[PDB]
Design an enzyme around this catalytic site. Sequence first.
Site, mmCIF file in Angstrom:
data_model
loop_
_atom_site.group_PDB
_atom_site.id
_atom_site.type_symbol
_atom_site.label_atom_id
_atom_site.label_comp_id
_atom_site.label_asym_id
_atom_site.label_seq_id
_atom_site.Cartn_x
_atom_site.Cartn_y
_atom_site.Cartn_z
ATOM 1 N N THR B 169 0.795 -1.212 0.000
ATOM 2 C CA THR B 169 0.000 0.000 0.000
ATOM 3 C C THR B 169 0.832 1.268 0.000
ATOM 4 O OG1 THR B 169 -0.164 -0.271 2.392
ATOM 5 C CG2 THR B 169 -2.000 -1.035 1.062
ATOM 6 N N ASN B 196 -0.040 -9.260 5.468
ATOM 7 C CA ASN B 196 -1.427 -9.128 5.054
ATOM 8 C C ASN B 196 -1.786 -9.995 3.867
ATOM 9 O OD1 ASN B 196 -2.699 -7.214 6.834
ATOM 10 N ND2 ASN B 196 -1.291 -5.695 5.993
ATOM 11 N N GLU B 244 7.119 -18.127 28.904
ATOM 12 C CA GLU B 244 7.532 -19.362 28.252
ATOM 13 C C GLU B 244 8.051 -19.117 26.846
ATOM 14 O OE1 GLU B 244 7.093 -21.880 30.777
ATOM 15 O OE2 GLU B 244 6.949 -19.783 31.412
HETATM 16 N N1 GTP Z 1 -4.043 -6.087 8.755
HETATM 17 C C1 GTP Z 1 -4.251 -4.802 9.013
HETATM 18 N N2 GTP Z 1 -3.343 -3.862 8.590
HETATM 19 C C2 GTP Z 1 -3.546 -2.557 8.849
HETATM 20 C C3 GTP Z 1 -4.664 -2.148 9.538
HETATM 21 N N3 GTP Z 1 -4.614 -0.810 9.651
HETATM 22 C C4 GTP Z 1 -3.491 -0.367 9.050
HETATM 23 N N4 GTP Z 1 -2.825 -1.441 8.544
HETATM 24 C C5 GTP Z 1 -1.547 -1.440 7.826
HETATM 25 O O1 GTP Z 1 -0.701 -0.393 8.245
HETATM 26 C C6 GTP Z 1 0.226 -0.152 7.213
HETATM 27 C C7 GTP Z 1 0.776 1.268 7.228
HETATM 28 O O2 GTP Z 1 0.636 1.906 8.477
HETATM 29 P P1 GTP Z 1 -0.709 2.728 8.742
HETATM 30 O O3 GTP Z 1 -1.530 1.976 9.749
HETATM 31 O O4 GTP Z 1 -1.450 2.891 7.445
HETATM 32 O O5 GTP Z 1 -0.329 4.176 9.314
HETATM 33 P P2 GTP Z 1 0.725 4.361 10.502
HETATM 34 O O6 GTP Z 1 1.492 3.094 10.755
HETATM 35 O O7 GTP Z 1 -0.017 4.798 11.732
HETATM 36 O O8 GTP Z 1 1.675 5.556 10.015
HETATM 37 P P3 GTP Z 1 1.041 7.000 9.713
HETATM 38 O O9 GTP Z 1 0.214 6.942 8.450
HETATM 39 O O10 GTP Z 1 2.150 8.000 9.536
HETATM 40 O O11 GTP Z 1 0.186 7.414 10.879
HETATM 41 C C8 GTP Z 1 -0.545 -0.414 5.934
HETATM 42 O O12 GTP Z 1 0.224 -1.209 5.073
HETATM 43 C C9 GTP Z 1 -1.769 -1.191 6.351
HETATM 44 O O13 GTP Z 1 -1.826 -2.406 5.652
HETATM 45 C C10 GTP Z 1 -5.580 -3.086 9.963
HETATM 46 O O14 GTP Z 1 -6.578 -2.735 10.578
HETATM 47 N N5 GTP Z 1 -5.373 -4.416 9.701
#
Ligand code: GTP
Lengths: 426, 427, 436, 51, 51
Positions: B169, B196, B244
């Site tokens: 992404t 993912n 553990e």
């Molecule tokens: N599996 C899963 N992945 C998530 C979820 N929410 C965010 N991600 C993953 O988080 C990755 C990037 O980080 P983000 O959560 O988008 O944003 P961040 O880590 O907080 O960084 P910032 O955008 O600067 O705030 C992406 O590749 C998403 O796939 C979720 O609810 N489930």
Amino acid sequence: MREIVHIQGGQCGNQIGAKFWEVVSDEHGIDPTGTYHGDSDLQLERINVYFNEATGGRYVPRAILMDLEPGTMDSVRSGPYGQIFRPDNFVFGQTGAGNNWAKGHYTEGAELIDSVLDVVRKEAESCDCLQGFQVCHSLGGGTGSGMGTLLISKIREEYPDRMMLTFSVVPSPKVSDTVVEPYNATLSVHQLVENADECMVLDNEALYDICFRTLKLTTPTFGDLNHLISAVMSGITCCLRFPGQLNADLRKLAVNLIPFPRLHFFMVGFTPLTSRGSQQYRALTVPELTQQMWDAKNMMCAADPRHGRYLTASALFRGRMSTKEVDEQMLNVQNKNSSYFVEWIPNNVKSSVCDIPPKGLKMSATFIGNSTAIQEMFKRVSEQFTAMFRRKAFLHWYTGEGMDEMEFTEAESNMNDLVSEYQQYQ
Amino acid sequence: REVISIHIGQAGIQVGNACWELYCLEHGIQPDGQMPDAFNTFFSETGAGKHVPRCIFLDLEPTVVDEVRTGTYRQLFHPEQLISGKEDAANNFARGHYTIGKEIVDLALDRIRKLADNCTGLQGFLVFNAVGGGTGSGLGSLLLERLSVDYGKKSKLGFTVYPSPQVSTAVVEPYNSVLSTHSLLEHTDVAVMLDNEAIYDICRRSLDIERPTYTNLNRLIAQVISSLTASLRFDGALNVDITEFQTNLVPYPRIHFMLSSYAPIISAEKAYHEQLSVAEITNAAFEPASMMVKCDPRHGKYMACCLMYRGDVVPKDVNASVATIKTKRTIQFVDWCPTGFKCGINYQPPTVVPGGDLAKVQRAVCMISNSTAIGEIFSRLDHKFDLMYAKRAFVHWYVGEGMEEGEFSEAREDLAALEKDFEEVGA
Amino acid sequence: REVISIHIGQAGIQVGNACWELYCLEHGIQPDGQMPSDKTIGGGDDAFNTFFSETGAGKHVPRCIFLDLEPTVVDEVRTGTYRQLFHPEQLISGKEDAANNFARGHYTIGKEIVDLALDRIRKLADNCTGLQGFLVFNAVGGGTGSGLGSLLLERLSVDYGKKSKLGFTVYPSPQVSTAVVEPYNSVLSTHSLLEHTDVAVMLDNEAIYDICRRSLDIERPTYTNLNRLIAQVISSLTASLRFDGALNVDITEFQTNLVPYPRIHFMLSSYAPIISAEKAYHEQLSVAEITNAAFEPASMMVKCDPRHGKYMACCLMYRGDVVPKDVNASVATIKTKRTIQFVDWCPTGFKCGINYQPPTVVPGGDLAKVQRAVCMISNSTAIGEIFSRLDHKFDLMYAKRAFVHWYVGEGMEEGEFSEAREDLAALEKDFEEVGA
Amino acid sequence: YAHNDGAPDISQAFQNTVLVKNWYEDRFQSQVASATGRTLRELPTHERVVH
Amino acid sequence: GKDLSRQAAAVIFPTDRPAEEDAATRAMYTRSHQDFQPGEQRRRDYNWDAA
Ligand SMILES: Nc1nc2c(ncn2[C@@H]2O[C@H](COP(=O)(O)OP(=O)(O)OP(=O)(O)O)[C@@H](O)[C@H]2O)c(=O)[nH]1
Ligand SMILES: Nc1nc2c(ncn2[C@@H]2O[C@H](COP(=O)(O)OP(=O)(O)OP(=O)(O)O)[C@@H](O)[C@H]2O)c(=O)[nH]1
Ligand SMILES: Nc1nc2c(ncn2[C@@H]2O[C@H](COP(=O)(O)OP(=O)(O)O)[C@@H](O)[C@H]2O)c(=O)[nH]1
Ligand SMILES: [Mg+2]
Ligand SMILES: [Mg+2]
């Protein structure tokens, strides 16, 4: 009179001892509330060995529970006969070791062993003449093995004259629960060979196979295994608890079974063990008990005794029987398979008889075999220990706590010397 | 015995948003905070008739945070347990690690300090973050640093969300993942990878949910976390605590990376369909169609395994199943560790969430193992990191924020060292 | 004095299912195995001892092993009325059937089931102390009773050998038949049954069908009625060991008195009086008529004609109210009669036996409890006629190599076919030689 | 050795009614369980494993 | 309508019809056509009381 102080370490020790105090309370006919409810006066004469009167017939056990997780204590108080233990004997830490001999022997012991030493001291001087101590614990875990062996070492330094039995479960590769089971096993057995008087080796492999083939249960939960171990321990101590035609105390068993101070590793068996679907096929005769006792499929250790030699052996009989049939049966089983016994000791079999069978039973027997085939099991452990110690797998969680690698080298050396001397006497 | 959990980033608190829904449903806690001792490791019982979790949500963008504050769980979470910055770190490790961290991290740690003070028998911390972003990577690493400085000896269970190899992404997530791994090595005591693409294939293949969102991912990941804290929470025949994983699965101080798995991932119809037994779920927990990280353990060698069991499980058949696993040769173990398993059993069966896609199962297995296919993961990520770094692309974002070329070089050669490490241990 | 009884095959264990019902009724033992509570057995219950071994208090387990490869009929015994009498460890059961295939029953599945049967029969003999001999039950037409049965007889003969083995086999009828390849299975069975067992008694089926049709006035008999009166024959044979009579003979007597040649051991059996409740009321029962009745082909168990043959020897067990004077008179009348002829080899061709206890039948019906009965076990040459009859129909199918591919697919070859064929021809030559 | 002696069965488990592998012994256990009134699972270890 | 009614099942397996009891008429069938149930003896009209 002669006094046994029971000591239980770790999760395994706490649960098997719960079942042990269940069956002993059953044999002395005391209710789960703490009052006598048996029939004959023969049971009242030897309850001092295991219980102490408090108030109004309240017979409380002479036991010490020891662990690091409260979950063991909840499982203690949950079941029946969980209310008869003294709350002051519920000594228990809070942190937890979790498969770590270092944590079990250098940190958690350092502030738990003193308090349990106070309570076991108060427990020891509360009675007059000890027979010794009886400890049931594990060797794979941390809070059992480390804390147990440290207590064993410290109490043997204080009271060097009293006997000591240790029921320790050893791990097998086919039933292999933990990963650092060799690191804990080797270090524990190295403590036992220098401090414990004699050890009754147990394992879950033999117990599961016994419950499959001889009992034929579909779901052999832990409670059944614990009860079979309990049956063994009760059968061991039958003679101090009841009169008989020929009594044999623990010291009498130790001197008849230990020819050399480092040859004190037994294999154990118990009879009768028949499926309750076939409880009417078999009668109750001494030869019927003997064929099931000397069988290899009935040992409680994963060691083929036919792959070695019996050094000595002992049989404890319960119930009214005939001594002639007992002796000639032991003589016959000694002369028929003559090659499986040693040659430079005649009459390797000690026998004993008490006149009270366990409750619901008519005639039983317990088997203690000092064989040289126990070195197969320690070799079965040593080769794994070498495989790990070659390049120090999992080593840092031990070394970073207060242990050095020289502990591992000397434990390796002591084990290799023991298996060598067993092979020598073979 | 209590354990507090922290959630960092946009991913961290959405996983927590599904995880704490599971905890409320497992301990029968209404979403307004009161029941209609087993819960005492997660929900402190404030006042009279009110349980309030031992958790912190944090992020730099207030959007997803006050979405929590206005969701169904308004009365459940402490007003200040959820921390919220003013402006995002925006996919930038330096921004999340040096500019904004310096003002959020101090409020975070003097907040969990009094969370730990209210706690009594703390096991440790377990963290939830993603490394592809900036908030999870930057101040997540900054927090982990100051956690290791403050307490250190308390365990740090790290469930991190790595970037998938093909499905992606973001663009700078290789840089951010590398710079985070450079500190995830010597700070987290043990870490579980979560990609993912692997979970998307799981929901596509087993659950047969053709177009899944993130909430399905979060829901079954919460199912995993619940299946490995069930031992602290409830009584079992053979319970294994948090310390553990520290011992039974970390053979070396810089090899702590574990593939996780879960079985049975089965919908509502295939449940009545299938006769759930311990043999087949112990088998199905090993084929890569059920691993939470897209890699193939065929190319690797196992070092240690751990198996949580929930429900109607007797030690007989679990012992028989692992015996069939050790005697099979399709999978292989390293020769320098013969006893490569650890078991654990808890009695309560895993509960279901209304509207969820998992069925009421009698028994479930959560496998956590170590391998060298993770050494394959880091190499595949390092290759495409060098691709971008040769041209010095995107670097001006980090340097202008405050860093330099040194951290790129040292994190690159560190991953090289980890590569040499894994290839040496595996043979 | 103790005798153990093994049952091999579908037919054998159903006969045993009726046989043990008769025994427990004779010694008055309830299906559960405990003795009747109201009636006291007494300390010296030696009679029960030959078949039932007293274990513990008040429980009797029989010295028997049912064994078979298909589990169906065995577990019907395990779930029937006699669940408590046998407990699970003697009832050996395989996993799949031999399916009318001597090769499959002797080589494929026998290799893993016979050793378990053998170290069980070892323990049974160890429990025993005064072992008289074995007696086996099998139908040579089937697959299990033929193949693994012969394998069992061989390994028993190499284990003990000297002890007598009473083989009560069920031969296929000439025209009445349920299988197709039973000529093959029968021939291959006799190939070992000739030189392994000691005393082997033949039991056909159509002869029993004729008996239930004529004397028992049962117009359509099932297998139950057949096995019931066969159990009557066996019980009347062993009643000399079970009970004290005026003139007792043990199991080694048929060994000496009935088998003049080490390979000529095949005995025709007969019983009298097979009689309903109505005919008994209208008929005066004495020894002379039943001693006659034991010799007409209308009361034999094998469909053959003793008229065309000459008798080698005869043995007569009498049960009930029998004095020696008139049985001596009747056998006098027989030896002076000329409708039947003996061989010129033996002038004294009889062997009598008297036991006090009358025959006992199921209380439900089919058989009126009589005052006296007789069981005849003789030796003649009509048996040689039977074997020649089976040999012809074996040769007819073998000439076109029919069904041979199943056996050679199992692993056998034409060698045992040809040598068994010539062995049976040798048996025919021996019968014709001794009969002259 | 002596205690291995076997291969674990890859087969499904029915109830005690179907005559598959251990129905006989399980049937006796279940029968005495119905006789007392309590279920088979809830039983004292001694009642389940001693004479 | 017809293959949902499934008349063939009813004609091949007449579940609606009562089974073969024929409690008293079996006696008259045995008397007239000499057709007993398999496991039965021929029954005469003997007055066993007189004897
Ligand atoms: N599996 C899963 N992945 C998530 C979820 N929410 C965010 N991600 C993953 O988080 C990755 C990037 O980080 P983000 O959560 O988008 O944003 P961040 O880590 O907080 O960084 P910032 O955008 O600067 O705030 C992406 O590749 C998403 O796939 C979720 O609810 N489930
Ligand atoms: N007298 C009598 N004979 C029976 C009975 N059942 C079967 N037979 C005979 O047995 C012959 C066939 O052999 P079976 O015993 O039925 O089967 P088997 O010997 O076990 O051989 P397999 O079927 O291959 O296992 C048939 O021709 C029947 O005549 C019975 O109940 N009573
Ligand atoms: N027979 C039996 N073995 C047990 C029981 N509980 C635990 N064990 C064994 O103990 C071993 C692990 O010991 P552990 O619980 O870690 O010891 P601890 O941590 O020091 O208390 C495992 O191999 C189990 O098989 C029990 O109730 N019965
Ligand atoms: Mg974000
Ligand atoms: Mg058959």
